[PDB]
Amino acid sequence: VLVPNKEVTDGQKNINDLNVKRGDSLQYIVTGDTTELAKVDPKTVTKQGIRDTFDAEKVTIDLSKVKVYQADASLNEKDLKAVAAAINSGKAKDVTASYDLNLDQNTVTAMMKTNADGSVVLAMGYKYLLVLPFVVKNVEGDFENTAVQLTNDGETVTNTVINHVPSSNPSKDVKADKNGTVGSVSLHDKDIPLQTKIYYEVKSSERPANYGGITEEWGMNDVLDTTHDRFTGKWHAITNYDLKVGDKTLKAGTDISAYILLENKDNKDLTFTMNQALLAALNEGSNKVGKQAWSVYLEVERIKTGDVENTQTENYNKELVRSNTVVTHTPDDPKPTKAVHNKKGEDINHGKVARGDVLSYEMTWDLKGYDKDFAFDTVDLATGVSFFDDYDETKVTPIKDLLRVKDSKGVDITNQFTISWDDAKGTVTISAKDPQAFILAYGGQELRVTLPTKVKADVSGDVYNSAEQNTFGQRIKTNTVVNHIPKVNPKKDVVIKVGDKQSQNGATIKLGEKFFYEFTSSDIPAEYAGVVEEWSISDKLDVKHDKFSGQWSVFANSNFVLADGTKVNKGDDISKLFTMTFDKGVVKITASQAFLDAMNLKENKNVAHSWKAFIGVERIAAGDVYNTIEESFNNEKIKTNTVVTHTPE
Amino acid sequence: PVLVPNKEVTDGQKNINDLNVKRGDSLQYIVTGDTTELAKVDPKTVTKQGIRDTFDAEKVTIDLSKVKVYQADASLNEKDLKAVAAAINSGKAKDVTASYDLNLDQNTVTAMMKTNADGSVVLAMGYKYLLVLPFVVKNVEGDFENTAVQLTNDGETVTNTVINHVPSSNPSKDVKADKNGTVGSVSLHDKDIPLQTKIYYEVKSSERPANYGGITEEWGMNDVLDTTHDRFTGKWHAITNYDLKVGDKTLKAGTDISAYILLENKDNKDLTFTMNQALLAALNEGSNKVGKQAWSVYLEVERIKTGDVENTQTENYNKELVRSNTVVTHTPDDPKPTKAVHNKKGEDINHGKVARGDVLSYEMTWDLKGYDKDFAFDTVDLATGVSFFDDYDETKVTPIKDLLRVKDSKGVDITNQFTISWDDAKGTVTISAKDPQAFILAYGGQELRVTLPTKVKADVSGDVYNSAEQNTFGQRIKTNTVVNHIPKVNPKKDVVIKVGDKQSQNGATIKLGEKFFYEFTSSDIPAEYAGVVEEWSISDKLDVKHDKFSGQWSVFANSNFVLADGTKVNKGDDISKLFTMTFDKGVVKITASQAFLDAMNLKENKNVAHSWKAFIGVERIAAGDVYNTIEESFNNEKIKTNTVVTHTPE
Ligand SMILES: [Mg+2]
Ligand SMILES: [Mg+2]
């Protein structure tokens, strides 16, 4: 036979049985020797050509690029470098126009043209090389090629070549960005806080091992939703396999950013392409033994709430393939708030209160944007999940046992936190014991913090509270609330008869003379926002000088109604609404519950309220006699001024 | 006639009958014998005139040399004790003590007028004669009374009886936390106080009683510090415990009176705090004697030595000293956490040379021996936590996070009491108790054991330091540092014609059909290797289109060693029987058998470095350039050799 030969080539070497990739531009070369046919009369050669059967499902052949060359029969067609030099030098002569070429589906035929006498027009004694340039489609699996040499009425088959197109697709992921370093956990389908910077990971497909193609271009494109993702300009690229460049091996994982060109259109349409030096290195033989792949990390700031999708499109040899689509979600920032209530549950911001009153601070702890889908890898978990409150320790005292945290269903969950008190600075920090576990079981809702405090005795002025939420370092402050503590000043005086105008403070009281100690209570202001639950005076009498025989009265210093409607006018005797005990030389006069209830009625909040008390005594010995009264309001004691009377001996 | 003598008790200005007094008070009894009715009789018939006073010598002290008699105008009101004191001071009431015979016998003072030759008393009748008996209250309890009798010739008339009370009240000492200079509210008595803690000693005065009739002449408290344990820092403050009016201002209970207190400081050891003259004067104002008076000093000391530390104070009230109770605190040694590094067999390998894939198991002690239920929690900020920190070299080892453990001194795993925080960027792990105070009550008082296993990374070399640190409520104590070494390795691939050859054919032409060998030289296992090799193998992915392998392979010993059963192996020996071969998917894999691994981990072989050479026989099949690279796996960690190349023409 004639032994026609068939090879597949990248243009320099035999690439039979090698892996190729979408868009590869390669060649088949079929040689039909006519050396043996040079021995007969050339006029007896009336048919000469090649019928080539290729796989049009997997490769594309442009008939206008098909060529036939007349080579010296000494040329070793197996030496594909020598063939390319021969084609380039002209020692393999282009004779294509002396052939009839046809393409039909899987079939390319090249037959020599014939003279009028029927004999083929080209000389025998030469090797004729049919060159079929082809382009690999974006397909999977094998493709074979075989040919037949046609000589007059006979046919001889060539050897069969084959190439493979292994599967590999581009992909995209989302990674955390800790001060520029890439995290190692995927953030797909997770929740990213506003202003967090994250990495988009755009991963090329893999170039297969034992590569017989040529990487002519390699690029990755990412079009960003610029209303949600702000490209910061910071990016890097790494090689995912060992890559030799010049005299050095760039090991797998090494940065190759310098070899990647960025085309940035308005921070929206970003294209990363390999430069010429890198493409040249990829085409060197040792880099085709193993796989090659690369990935780009591009940094975006999340600037808007919602669901944010990302996709990339990989260009390999002009063949575009889109990756998977990744999504992340961005919630509204937390909106923690602060309020102040009284003991009845009523809101009393800006309200005036008195010693011993309960100021119940109620805060919302807003964890609606932090739940099981949170991107924990974006934060330093050790910074904790906490709530902080800065109260005025010079004016209020927290009831530490009653600090509670409740969830949105009203369930006490205080036991999930450690509570740290800083008494000197007057702050309290509530910290989740197990932050990640806490976000999983209790996140996704608003929590309610209750911080009861009590107004101190003998302080006045404005009382501020503020608070702050700290979620893994995201610090959001609440509003500030304020209460007012008007100064009070209960007084003691001395009068001869109940209702006298002339003070006897500092005056002479004779032996056997009867007189009255007079008391004026603290004022509760108009629109008082607290709740008075106790109101009394204690007068420790100097029993050797002042003799108490049970005489006392209390008078209204304001107009008010009782719960049962009965009116009380300023100056009225209301001793019926008070009680008196005398024990261990102490006169104690105490407001009844009927009087307290009256002081707390909304109907009486239009005016301020106070009362006057009188304690009847007889001076029974000589000397100087001091008197001070202790007034108790909400069980908090303060002292009147100290009065003085003189009984000379 | 008839006579009514009077007896009064005074602080010098006022009637103090029935009032409360205090140790060391300086007071006076005054007995008035009126002789106005006796002025009408013949003075020669008055032959005996005087007073016999009966006091409580068990409760007050009278010095006879201070007893005086004054001759006062009969119009002087001896009940106006201010008027009496002025008359005595000016001489308007004349001192006639020289005309009296005075005597003190136990509970009795007698003062009798002297007499002329005829027996008549030497002093004129018609005056009031005031006998003044100054006394000092002793440190006693309960009541003391005084009564006198006026003697007129053979008659006797008793005076009224006066009485005072000595209510009991002692000084005290306590110990309070010192947080940023503010005083804690929890008593640290008998609690555990770490070294370098600043605490407040609280020295509290006794109480001056309500309804006071005395005079506070001086008031001080003294504290002698043990300067080997307590370093006085120089800062202190004082508070009043009751309302104290000064001038026309009222210092309410609890407010600071430091400006009125003086500190005499002898060498930071002997501290005495005393009320200044302005405060003493305010304490004598009448309104300040109605109710109680008392004060406290807070003095700051740094605890600078371990052991049991006692403190006591001595209160000086009107020169009478009373010692307070004695408080005690305890100071244990600081924690002594340690760090060690063990290989996978459990041997300590500090300074040991190690290799890729080897386990460096860091074992640390977490010393909480001094932190138990008696700990003074009020001295620390609880938010600072209870934690243990390890800073490993993240560029050379990687931790096996799932195997981090904490155990107590009884071997119980307690890892779930802690939050484990990994910082991969700085290469640290922080182990913090979820509930720090509760954790100390439940698990404090023992030594905990922390296990942090790590593996050596592939393709790294040099020194590997590890250190750790114990943070107990802000008390930071470092462990020792351990170090390991990772000698560089360089397994290589080469090309030769025959196994023994030395002429490298890397980069040379090998003709078509020619048979040759790929040569591999393993990584070195160092002399004195401290790790453990559990896997050692090479994989060579052959270019099957060009290199034809048909089962020819050899492994040569590159060092001398011995086996478990005794067999001796020399350098250059063929040891292929201690290796196995597979040829799957064009990849030749040559693997060390367990018996060769067992050999490389024997102590007997540790004197020398160890490696091996392998040879893979191949026949070249096609023309063109042919590349070869080998991946060597050591403890399942892969690194690759140099890449060789050969050329075949035609
Ligand atoms: Mg505060
Ligand atoms: Mg580190």
Residue numbers in the entry:
A (entry chain B): 585 to 1233
B (entry chain A): 584 to 1233
The publication says:
One of the best studied adhesins is PrgB from the conjugative plasmid pCF10 of Enterococcus faecalis, which has been shown to play major roles in conjugation, biofilm formation, and importantly also in bacterial virulence. PrgB is the main adhesin produced by pCF10 and has been studied for well over three decades. This protein is around 140 kDa in size and possesses an N-terminal signal sequence and a C-terminal LPXTG cell wall anchor motif. PrgB, which is indicated to function as a dimer in vivo, distributes over the entire surface of the cell wall and increases cellular aggregation, biofilm formation, and the efficiency of plasmid transfer. PrgB seems to consist of an N-terminal disordered region (residues 35–197), followed by a newly identified coiled-coil (COI) domain (residues 198–257), the previously crystallized polymer adhesin domain (residues 261–558), a linker region (residues 559–582), four immunoglobulin (Ig)-like domains (residues 583–1232), and finally the C-terminal disordered region containing the LPXTG motif (residues 1263–1305) that gets anchored to the cell wall.
Crystals belonging to space group P212121 appeared after 8–12 weeks, diffracted to 1.85 Å and contained two molecules in the asymmetric unit. Surprisingly, the resulting electron density lacked the previously crystallized polymer adhesin domain of PrgB, and instead only contained residues 584–1233. There is also no space in the crystal packing to allow for a flexible polymer adhesin domain, so it was likely cleaved off in the crystallization drop before the crystals were formed. The modeled protein indeed consists of four Ig-like domains: two CSA and two CSC domains. The Ig-like domains seem to come in pairs of two slightly different structures, denoted as CSA1–CSC1 (first pair) and CSA2–CSC2 (second pair), as named in InterPro (CSA from IPR026345; adhesin isopeptide-forming adherence domain, and CSC from IPR032300; cell-surface antigen C-terminal). In each of the Ig-like domains of PrgB, isopeptide bonds are formed between a lysine and an asparagine, a bond which is further stabilized by an aspartic acid. There is density in the conserved metal-binding site of the CSA2 domain that has been suggested to bind Ca2+ in the Antigen I/II proteins. Refinement of our structure indicated that Mg2+ was the best fit to the density. The homologous C2 domains from AspA, Pas, SpaP, and SspB, each have an extra structural feature termed the BAR (SspB adherence region) domain, which mediates adherence in these proteins. This BAR domain is absent in PrgB. The structure that we determined shows that these two sequence motifs are not surface exposed, but instead play an important role in the structural integrity of the interfaces between CSA1 and CSC1, and between CSA2 and CSC2.
